[PDB]
Design a protein around this ligand. Sequence first.
Ligand SMILES: O=C(O)c1cccnc1
Ligand SMILES: O=C(O)c1cccnc1
Lengths: 191, 191
Amino acid sequence: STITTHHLTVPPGLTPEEFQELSSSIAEFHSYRINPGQCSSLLAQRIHAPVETVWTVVRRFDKPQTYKHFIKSCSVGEDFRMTVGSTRDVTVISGLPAATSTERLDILDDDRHVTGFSIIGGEHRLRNYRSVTTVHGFERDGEIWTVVLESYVVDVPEGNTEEDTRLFADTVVKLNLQKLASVTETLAREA
Amino acid sequence: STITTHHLTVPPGLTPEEFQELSSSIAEFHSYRINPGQCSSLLAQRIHAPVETVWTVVRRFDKPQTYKHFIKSCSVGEDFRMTVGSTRDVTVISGLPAATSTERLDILDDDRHVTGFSIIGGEHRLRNYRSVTTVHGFERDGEIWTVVLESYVVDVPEGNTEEDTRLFADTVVKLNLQKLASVTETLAREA
Ligand SMILES: O=C(O)c1cccnc1
Ligand SMILES: O=C(O)c1cccnc1
């Protein structure tokens, strides 16, 4: 059992100067105690849009399809409210027969721009998956931009190397963060 | 048994005027006779780069990782030459235990900018997968751009709707074409 070290390495796609401004947030929100058989990763994405524009999309637990790829549909309860412990049923585009991943909302902090979720049923390739996404505003000489950080911890299935699990989860997260950027930059450029 | 009708519908992300310039090419290269239990799709991507810049990337059968997502590695023979009937072994990022998809190069026409491949082993979700990619130059008042068209035909696995198979294959193709655009536009803007 160890503690992750995401707060001591510059995540790809981030400047060292950006990283050093984010160190405390990475320690607070993007650290995990990991056991053997588990792996963890931290991904970053710079977005040329204001923080609240990005957050408004990131915080919509009931509409992951807005920025995530491979979502066929997302269903929530009839009296769903955006509250910790609530769940969503996501239908992922797998090439396999129709199914659903049940996901639990773990964190929602509208003041600090933190959210996170856990996969609690369905996707057997990501058993014990848990992620946290945070949104951060930057300013330099009157210019503003945003950085989104997303980390996860996950169990490595029996009969898989860590390096294959990480490579799948990283690719999904990185692609989703790219879509988040395009979606919110379009919104920023247009609105 | 029917003939696909990709040449009579405007593919998403294409203007009707672009489509009507491409009708003959869609009929020649992006038509398939499909049997029940099979589905087919045509995808388009506009790229702001010259045709040969895009083609140089599209034609590299031995380096699909340059524009495709989820590729861990690609291996070809020791005396591999870029010739029809040649194969490549691609390791796809599945979240599942390491494996390989064997893919056959079906077409290569450097004069008409046509290529295509078939999956001939591995990916059981895409049995009988076959695609064709063509690259087309456009000009308007001295401005030039490119359009890439990619179609496939594939068997729908037992225990799957067509709509789930198509949605997976379409998402993969569309995402790959997006990467192709970014890769080649970067190359065009920079070089
Ligand atoms: O955020 C998700 O839904 C996700 C991330 C990594 C892998 N699979 C799913
Ligand atoms: O082009 C590919 O490699 C591909 C396209 C669709 C689905 N799976 C793979």
